[PDB]
């Protein structure tokens, strides 16, 4: 097995792969059509000890081997000029070979483990968890725990271990331990990202009704985000609907309906867009399961309406039409206003397929912001600035390195422009307020918070060489008002502003330390 953990990985004589063995171990797990022939052709089982089906012993030997192996192997990361915010970043494996082999083994076992009926796994369902829980308590940042325990609890529900748990002492202790572990990892759900977030989603959404019945409201936002991600990745929605059916059949509609209001709506976009696991059978699944419910019961998918102005976004970014443009032609130059295009082009630049709609949208938005900058030499786009630059900082931290490479030089150039003396009064104030009140406050977008930190850190430059300090005093904007704003945000009870201020100074370290 520690040989087989050295296989090559796959992405989501010739060198082998893990799959080249998985069926074999299923053939080993299902060695019932093959040892039967051997015991039939043999007559040795007269003074021989055993004549039973040894596939149970095969599973036990595999489990004890993998247990001692994973106890033997150890995994850890290391760090590394510039500080990083999230503990999930600035992580480099101390011995990446161990990480790679751990990968190899986990996607090797992920298919072999669940197919066999788990009466063989029953004696392990407690023990195999405990030290693994240890392995999770010391290292709570591993996807293998979540997904392997997903298939583990699937096998357990194939055996029904959690049935009739005490409100058996062994069952009571194991059930309570998984309950507390599940609730704490549900609390910690918020800080994980893809290939780690998805795994713990599969975990905290594969648990049996004996645990959902205890708490629902904590998982309500978890279900919302899991189903909004199931649009992007169908298996999430598939296992989500399976879990929904499990507890809904198993738990009475007496403590979940006060949450049905915000439980239901996150499914709409599934059926709104189109006419192993695909979105189409996803929809057909939700279709009949929704119809299985009563009328008033399934009325609560329309409850998301308080943000009707947010989905509207038809409030004019510029109330008057300030984006006049006469298209150059021979005998006709129609004057065209570009304020109406803003919402649609925002969701293009944010959400577009083919990966080439986005880049062309970026090109047009560069051109049109450039044209409006040229136009500004004649209107108040105060409201336009407030409503439009937040999506610009939203697209600042895009996963596309091409997008950041396009955008950050423009960010620093507009920094140069804004902190100039001619742009230091009454028109940068809107830009600075919208840029500081968004992008660092968010519960998400750690990359965006870091990018805001770096851009303000470099904004310190040309805030002193383009504005003389006496002018900083004359202008109402100065270091002092920035200090009061920082203090006010830092004292805010929401911990997002606290972490934002601490990280902001952590960034300005090596820059503010030169201040005298």
């Amino acid at each position: 097995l520690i040989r087989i953990c050295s296989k090559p990985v796959v992405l989501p004589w010739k060198v082998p792969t893990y799959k080249d063995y998985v069926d074999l171990f299923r053939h080993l797990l299902s060695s019932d059509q093959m040892m039967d022939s051997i015991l039939a052709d043999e007559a040795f089982f007269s003074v021989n000890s055993s004549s039973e089906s040894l596939n149970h012993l095969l599973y036990d030997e595999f489990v004890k081997s993998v247990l001692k192996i994973v106890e033997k192997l150890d995994l850890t990361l290391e760090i590394q000029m510039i500080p990083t915010s999230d503990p999930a970043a600035n992580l480099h494996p101390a011995k990446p070979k161990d990480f790679s082999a751990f990968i190899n083994l986990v996607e090797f076992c992920r298919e072999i483990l669940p197919e066999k009926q788990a009466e063989f796994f029953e004696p392990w369902v407690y023990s195999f968890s405990y030290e693994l829980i240890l392995q999770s308590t010391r290292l709570p940042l591993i996807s293998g725990f979540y997904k392997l325990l997903s298939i583990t609890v699937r096998n357990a529900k194939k055996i029904k271990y959690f049935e009739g748990v005490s409100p058996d002492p062994e069952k009571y202790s194991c059930f309570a331990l998984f309950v507390k572990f599940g609730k704490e990892v549900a609390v910690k759900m918020k800080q994980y990202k893809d290939e780690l977030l998805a795994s713990c989603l599969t975990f905290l959404l594969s648990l049996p009704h004996n645990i959902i019945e205890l708490d629902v409201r904590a998982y309500v936002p978890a279900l919302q985000m899991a189903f909004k991600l199931g649009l992007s990745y169908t298996p999430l929605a598939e296992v989500g609907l399976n879990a929904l059916e499990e507890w809904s059949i198993y738990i009475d509609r007496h403590v979940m309906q006060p949450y049905y209001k915000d439980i239901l709506p996150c499914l709409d976009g599934y059926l709104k867009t189109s006419a192993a696991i695909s979105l189409e059978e996803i929809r057909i699944r939700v279709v009949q399961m929704l119809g299985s419910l009563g009328g008033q019961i399934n009325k609560n998918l329309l409850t998301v309406t308080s943000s009707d102005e947010m989905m509207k976004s038809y409030v004019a970014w510029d109330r008057e039409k300030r984006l006049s443009f006469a298209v150059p032609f021979r005998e006709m130059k129609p004057v065209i206003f570009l304020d109406v295009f803003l919402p649609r082009v925002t969701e293009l630049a944010l959400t577009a397929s083919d990966r080439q709609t986005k880049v062309a949208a970026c090109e047009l938005l560069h051109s049109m912001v450039m044209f409006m900058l040229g136009k500004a030499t004649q209107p108040p786009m105060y409201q336009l600035y407030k409503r439009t630059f937040p999506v610009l900082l939203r697209l600042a931290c895009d996963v596309d390195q091409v997008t950041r490479q396009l955008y950050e030089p423009l960010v620093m150039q507009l920094i140069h422009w804004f902190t100039n003396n001619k742009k230091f009064e009454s028109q940068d104030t809107v830009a600075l307020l919208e840029a500081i009140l968004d992008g660092i406050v968010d519960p998400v977008d750690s990359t965006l918070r870091d990018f805001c930190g770096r851009c303000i850190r470099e904004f310190l430059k040309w805030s002193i060489k383009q504005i003389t300090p006496q002018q900083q005093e004359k202008s109402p904007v100065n270091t002092k008002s920035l200090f009061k704003r920082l203090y006010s945000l830092a004292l805010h009870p929401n911990a997002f502003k606290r972490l934002g201020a601490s990280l902001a100074f952590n960034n300005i370290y090596r820059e503010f330390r030169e201040e005298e």
Partner: peptide, 27 residues
């Protein structure tokens, strides 16, 4: 597949509003 692009705008300290109409026309 592979990327497609049409303009790698010039680099500086500020923008150059000297750019022609065609640049805003094509996207």
């Amino acid at each position: 597949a592979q990327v497609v692009l049409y303009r790698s705008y010039r680099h500086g300290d500020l923008p150059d509003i000297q750019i022609k109409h065609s640049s805003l026309i094509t996207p």
